[PDB]
Structures are given as structure tokens and as C-alpha cells.
Design a protein around this ligand. Structure first.
Ligand SMILES: NC(=O)c1c(NC(=O)C2CC2)sc2c1CCCC2
Ligand SMILES: [Cl-]
Length: 654
């Protein structure tokens, strides 16, 4: 079978797992090329010695196995050899005498230390044998071995995991999938007051069954003091100031993701900080880049607050990534925002054609008010005091909402942030932007500009026509939740109001990911039409699901955007053809299509025998146009417009 990762968005073929015997290295040696100081990262023992001290920092190093095949540690562990190497030295395979010679793994605890440092390292880590999780290697024992120098050396005894480490660059979907699998391990550690500290490709292993974290050597308590473990290039800059935190583990996830996916520059053996400036991976996957930047923010307060919170955003990002590279949408229900409450801009394009019916000016433009009422809203925090009354209010229109909340307010909700935020939502839905902003600004003076306040500020700035600030503030929210589609839709709609070309292609990203977001289909189509791609716009509009009440509109919209070859005129006719005279706007678009095909025959010849039921001759099209106009004349809501259509009918008449 295959690993079903990312909730089945990423399938990875299972490989059987390396048997102890096959894992053993014949001649364990670190080649000169690969000799580096574990402490400062610099080249060490080069021509060229296998053991010595680093000339740069003074740290002792050894590239020689400390246990040899044949050895017996603590009268219990029968050593067979080395299966791997890292910063703390060789990794040893032993057979466990006290459990039928089960294979176990031994690794050193410290790099150097007197007998006390050695015992202390063991004593301080003994608690790890109570850290239990399915995605975490098991610790079996702590063991002391007297070496050649007569010195006690401490070892940790672990489960053998014969998988494949994640350590030349993974596709981003794959890497996200892997990290999604171990984040629950990190959440688990956090819930018990532990930090993993040393997350990196090396420490994550794909086995036949699962993903495992295979090294617990750096695990410590939150805010702990003493030696802080981790690896420069992956570990949080502030770790000496703050000590280990959830925040510091979040940093290592971002770093780990970057390391697995990007061409990160190195100085020493170490990855340099931040992200490469114009990386092609980050260009193709916009939200993946934003996710990375939040996770690795130099300010720990600006990173994801929890591993679970990060996991939700990373899932959203994965959906965006997979949808883009497969061409198949991956819808999901947000943990942050509501689903869209409505659609906007669906009948802009076809409302223009309404002139055929009524004779009225129809120059419909996308409006802030239509967008505002359609936008997703932030989910209410259930720990807020008003959460019960707000859940009761959920089906209430804007004015009824305001009334219920103000009544509820007048008789303890003094401290509530969500009650006022709901009043703002409602006032904005009604157009009372001035009242809303007063209310927001007051609230921001009590609790500051928390992200929900910034969201509703951006919305207000939409109604105000201050599109630059709206973009700025929606972006802040996006960068806080890069895996959410709500903020991307809001930014695509703002760009439209502002008359900017959206260089981030938010409509496309939104629609690619979730073909339930019909606003995005029409938005995306309008952008493709704008740059001469009438083919892509129709392509986009074709993806509108037939289950939607907007399907017919999307079909008629295609006809309209198509009007230039004969095959395009046929495409346009084909979309109109299927729809009954019952459906609103059909008659006028029929007229428009036959009209287009008439103007076409002035400069072209048909190799088809009909458009819309009429002969594809000048005579047939004129007859078709005529008949369409006379039919529109009979439903024209004014006698003045009736005369207009009749006149046009007489004129076009063959
Ligand atoms: N526990 C393991 O099996 C293990 C490893 N196992 C392997 O390398 C299996 C042979 C392919 S490497 C490693 C460990 C634990 C500490 C960190 C380094
Ligand atoms: Cl021993």
C-alpha cells in the first residue's frame, strides 16, 4: 500500500524497512570531506586527524566509533556495529539480552564530560522514558560504559527504526505532508511542557508504517535553563534570551520546511538565516512562502501560537499547493473564517446586455457593498463572554442583530470583544461605515488592533474607497493565516475595485483550490478577458458546477465574453442553445449571438449550416436577429423601448 499523507492529498509508496543486519556499516568511517566541528560547524581534522580538538573553538571531536563490534555495554547490550553518524557521533546497533536479543540503538549523551557531567546528563534525561507517542522513538534505558581511558561514558538506548531519514530537494506537497504528520507529536510534547528543540530533516524518518521523530536527545522543559540544544541554521535566534518555548519549536518547523524544499545558501555547513530573496519555489507557491516567513519570524510573538494552529494553516497551504499542481480543487472548511456568505460580481458582465430588454443604461460596476455582504467573516472565539448570545443571533439580519445585541448589552458583557465586533460586522453590512469605525477605534483603544479588528478595518476601508489601506490590512491578515482563502478573495476584490492588475493572482488561487467559490470564477474570468485571453475566461467559466444556480449565468457570460473565429461563434451559440426561453437573459443573449454571427458574415464564410436554429446565411441570421428583436419587443417593459426594438427589427429584416 501507499502512505496516505496530508489527509490523502499526498500518496507516498511504502518501502519495507531496513533490517538490522543490512543497516550495519562494514567500514564506518567519516571521510575527510565530511569532517566538521559539531559545535562551530567549521572544517576540522583536515590534511589530517580523526580525533583532536577544534583549533577554532576548542571543542573535542572524534570521528572514531567508541563502541566496537563484539563489545557488551552494561552487561546487557551486545554491540554489532554502526548504522549511522551525526553530531554526537556514531549510532550503534546492539542486541538486547534482557528482551530476547531485540535490536536496540545506542547513542552518546554528551560530547565530553567528567564522570559527574556524564551521570548528570543521564539523571536529567531519565524523564524521557515516560515520553510516549506513536510518532516518537521509544527510549528503553540509560546506560554507563567505562571506556579505554577508564572513564564512564553515558549512552541512551532506543528502539531501532529502520526507516529513511528526510535528509536533493523534495517537492513542496511532499514536504508539507511529512511535517503535517509530526506536528501532532510536537503538540503532544508541548501539552506536557516539553520542547523538541532539534527538529531537522536528519531527525525525521519515514518508516513503512509512519513518520517518526527519532532523536529525543535535545528534548527539554519550556523556559528551562542550562545547556540549550539544537543546531545553528535551524534553531531560533532568541533561544538564549527566552529559553526553549513553543515559539522556538515553531521556528524549527519553518526552517525544516525551507531546508527540505529550497536552495538555501550555506556559510560553514550552516544554512543562513531568512529565505533566499527571489526563490522560484516561493514564486510558484505564494501562500507557502508566507507560511514559512511567519513560522521563522525573528520575533517569537509573530509566529504561529501553537503547533495545532500552524497545522491548520499548513493544511490549507497544502490544499493550495496540490490543487495548483494537479489541476483538481481541494476544498476544505476553514477553522478561522466562515464560508462565503454570498457571491459578488456574478452578473456584472451579462447585466450590461439587459439594455436589449429595457433600454436602460446598464453600466454595472463591481461595488464594495456587494463584496462586503458576501465576504467570509471571522469565527467567534467560543471563550468570549458573549459567545452564547452571538450563536443565538446567527440567523438574524443586520438590524435585528444590532437590536438584540444592544438590548442584551443594556441588561455582564462589559469585557466582551466579540459582541462589539459583531456590531461592527452588522453596521458594515448596512453601510454605516462611520458608526462602524468609531466602534472599532474605541474597541482598539481597549484591546489593541487584534487581527479581527484589522479584518473589519480593511472591510471598512473598502466601503470608504481607501483601497491602499484595505490591501495593507487584508494582507496583514493573510500573512497571519496564509492557508486561508477568505483573505485572498478579499484582496482579489480590492485589486479590482482599485483598478489594479493582481500580480498575486488571488482569484486564480482561490478558484483553483475551491470550485465552490463562484465569485472567484467570475473574478478570474474578468481578469483573463481584460488581457485578451477570452479563451481562458471561458475555460474558467466552464468549471462552474452545474449544481449552482449561477451555472446558467456563467454559460451566458461565456457567450458574452466570446464576442474572432467561426468556431468561437459556434462556442458562443452552443452555450446559449441548451437554455430554454424560460430562463432570464436567454432571449437577449440569443439576439446578441445571432447579431455577432451576422456581423461576422460580412467578412467571412460559414462551413456550418446553422446558428441557434437559423440558417447560417445572411438571410437566416437577419431572420434570426429580427425574430429575436420582435420577441424582445413583446416583453419590453416600456412602449418607448417597444418602438426601439420594432424599428431595429424592421431594419435588420431580410
Ligand atoms: N533509532 C534509530 O534507529 C536511529 C537510526 N536508524 C537508522 O539509521 C536506520 C538504519 C537506517 S539513525 C538515528 C537513530 C536514533 C538517533 C538519531 C540517529
Ligand atoms: Cl559497561
Amino acid at each position: 500500500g501507499s502512505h496516505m499523507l496530508g489527509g490523502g492529498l499526498v500518496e507516498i509508496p511504502r518501502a519495507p524497512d531496513i533490517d538490522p543486519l543490512e543497516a550495519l556499516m562494514t567500514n564506518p568511517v567519516v571521510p575527510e570531506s565530511k569532517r566538521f566541528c559539531w559545535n562551530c560547524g567549521r572544517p576540522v581534522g583536515r590534511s589530517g586527524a580523526s580525533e583532536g580538538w577544534c583549533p577554532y573553538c576548542g571543542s573535542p571531536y572524534s570521528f572514531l566509533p567508541q563502541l566496537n563490534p563484539g563489545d557488551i555495554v552494561a552487561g546487557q547490550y551486545e554491540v554489532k556495529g554502526c548504522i549511522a553518524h551525526g553530531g554526537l557521533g556514531w549510532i550503534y546497533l546492539a542486541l538486547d539480552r534482557n528482551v530476547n536479543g531485540r535490536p536496540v540503538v545506542l547513542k552518546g549523551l554528551v560530547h565530553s564530560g567528567d564522570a559527574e557531567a556524564q551521570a548528570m546528563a543521564m539523571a536529567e534525561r531519565q524523564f524521557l522514558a515516560e515520553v510516549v507517542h506513536p510518532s516518537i522513538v521509544q527510549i528503553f534505558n540509560f546506560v554507563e560504559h567505562t571506556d579505554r581511558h577508564g572513564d564512564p561514558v553515558g549512552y541512551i538506548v532506543m528502539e531501532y527504526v529502520g526507516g529513511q531519514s528526510l535528509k536533493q530537494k523534495l517537492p513542496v506537497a511532499e514536504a508539507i505532508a511529512y511535517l503535517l504528520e509530526i506536528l501532532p507529536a510536537l503538540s503532544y510534547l508541548h501539552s506536557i511542557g516539553l520542547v523538541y528543540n532539534d527538529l531537522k530533516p536528519e531527525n525525521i524518518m519515514l518508516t513503512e508504517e509512519q513518520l517518526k521523530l527519532i532523536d529525543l536527545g535535545a528534548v527539554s522543559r519550556i523556559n528551562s535553563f542550562g545547556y540549550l540544544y539544537g543546531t545553528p541554521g535551524f534553531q531560533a535566534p532568541e533561544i538564549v534570551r527566552t529559553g526553549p518555548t513553543v515559539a522556538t519549536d515553531i521556528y524549527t518547523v519553518g526552517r525544516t520546511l525551507a531546508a527540505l524544499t529550497l536552495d538555501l545558501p550555506t556559510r560553514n555547513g550552516r544554512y543562513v538565516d531568512g529565505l533566499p530573496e527571489d526563490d522560484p519555489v516561493l514564486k510558484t507557491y505564494d501562500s507557502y512562502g508566507r507560511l514559512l516567513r511567519r513560522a521563522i519570524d525573528p520575533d517569537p510573538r509573530q509566529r504561529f501560537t501553537t503547533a495545532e494552529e500552524m497545522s491548520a494553516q499548513l493544511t490549507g497551504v497544502l490544499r493550495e499547493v496540490v490543487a495548483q499542481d494537479t489541476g483538481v480543487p481541494r476544498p476544505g472548511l476553514s477553522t478561522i473564517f466562515s464560508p462565503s456568505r454570498s457571491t459578488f460580481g456574478v452578473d456584472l458582465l451579462v447585466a450590461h446586455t439587459d439594455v436589449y430588454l429595457d433600454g436602460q443604461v446598464h453600466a454595472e460596476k463591481l461595488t464594495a457593498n456587494e463584496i462586503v455582504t458576501a465576504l467570509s467573516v471571522p469565527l467567534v472565539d467560543p471563550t468570549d463572554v458573549a459567545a452564547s448570545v452571538l450563536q443565538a443571533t446567527v440567523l438574524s439580519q443586520p438590524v435585528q442583530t444590532l437590536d438584540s445585541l444592544r438590548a442584551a448589552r443594556h441588561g455582564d458583557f462589559s469585557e466582551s470583544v466579540e459582541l462589539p465586533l459583531m456590531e461592527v460586522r452588522a453596521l458594515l453590512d448596512l453601510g454605516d461605515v462611520a458608526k462602524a469605525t468609531r466602534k472599532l477605534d474605541d474597541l482598539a483603544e481597549r484591546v489593541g488592533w487584534r487581527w479581527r479588528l484589522v479584518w473589519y478595518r480593511a472591510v471598512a476601508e473598502l466601503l470608504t474607497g481607501d483601497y491602499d489601506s484595505a490591501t495593507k490590512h487584508f494582507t496583514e491578515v493573510l500573512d497571519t493565516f496564509p492557508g486561508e482563502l477568505a483573505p485572498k478573495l478579499a484582496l482579489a476584490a480590492t485589486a479590482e475595485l482599485a483598478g489594479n492588475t493582481d500580480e498575486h493572482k488571488f482569484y486564480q488561487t482561490v478558484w483553483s483550490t475551491n470550485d465552490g467559490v463562484i465569485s472567484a470564477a467570475f473574478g478570474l474570468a474578468r481578469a483573463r478577458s481584460a488581457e485578451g485571453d477570452r479563451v481562458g475566461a471561458v475555460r474558467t467559466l466552464d468549471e462552474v458546477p452545474p449544481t449552482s444556480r449561477h451555472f446558467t449565468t456563467a454559460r451566458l457570460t461565456s457567450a458574452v465574453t466570446l464576442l474572432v473565429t467561426e468556431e468561437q461563434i459556434r462556442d458562443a451559440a452552443r452555450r446559449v442553445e441548451a437554455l430554454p426561453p424560460t430562463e432570464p437573459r436567454v432571449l437577449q443573449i440569443r439576439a446578441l449571438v445571432l447579431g455577432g454571427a451576422l456581423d461576422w458574415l460580412k467578412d467571412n464564410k460559414a462551413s456550418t449550416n446553422h446558428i441557434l436554429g437559423f440558417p447560417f446565411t445572411s438571410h437566416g441570421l437577419r431572420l434570426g436577429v429580427e425574430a429575436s428583436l420582435r420577441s424582445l419587443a413583446r416583453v419590453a417593459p416600456t412602449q418607448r423601448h417597444r418602438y426601439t426594438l420594432v424599428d431595429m427589427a424592421n431594419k435588420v429584416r431580410p
